[PDB]
Design a binder for this molecule. Sequence first.
Ligand SMILES: CC1(C)Nc2nc(N)[nH]c(=O)c2N=C1C(=O)NCC(=O)N(CC(=O)NC[C@H]1O[C@@H](n2cnc3c(N)ncnc32)[C@H](O)[C@@H]1O)CP(=O)(O)O
Ligand SMILES: [Cl-]
Length: 151
Amino acid sequence: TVAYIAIGSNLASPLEQVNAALKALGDIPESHILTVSSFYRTPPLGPQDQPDYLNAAVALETSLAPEELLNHTQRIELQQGRVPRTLDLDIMLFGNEVINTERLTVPHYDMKNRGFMLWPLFEIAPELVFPDGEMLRQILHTRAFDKLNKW
Ligand SMILES: CC1(C)Nc2nc(N)[nH]c(=O)c2N=C1C(=O)NCC(=O)N(CC(=O)NC[C@H]1O[C@@H](n2cnc3c(N)ncnc32)[C@H](O)[C@@H]1O)CP(=O)(O)O
Ligand SMILES: [Cl-]
């Protein structure tokens, strides 16, 4: 199953965290990195008195159950300092699954509202269709999220 994972950090020099995160994602068992987006410099959506984010998306093939994937992404966050934002790993999509448990809401509850999630995802999955049948390309068009700048 292909999982799509969003990466975010707004440390001053976030490349170390993001590069480290990508290496660690590749070490997850029974999993393989398929494709990684470009790295983007995005203004924070929410409070504005914080540094810009580095955002990216990665497509990860995995045989793990969605919760076992979450265990591994949480481990990576912990090991890089998560306890500005050092590193957040959000599971955006997990195959065609819709999940609503105490640990997971998939698709990510807010991703359709976040250009900094959707644009990097579009780079690596331009023909993507959500579980509800909506095309990623169409969502980006409708919301008119401004395109991103590379880091
Ligand atoms: C600050 C804000 C709004 N503004 C931004 N602006 C720009 N420019 N760029 C950004 O990148 C950016 N980022 C933003 C942001 O907050 N991003 C992360 C996010 O979405 N949250 C907070 C969080 O810590 N997230 C990781 C944890 O989520 C858990 N986790 C992972 N996957 C799932 C899932 N599928 N279901 C449930 N939990 C999950 C896991 O345990 C992880 O540790 C959830 P919330 O606080 O919005 O509810
Ligand atoms: Cl470790």
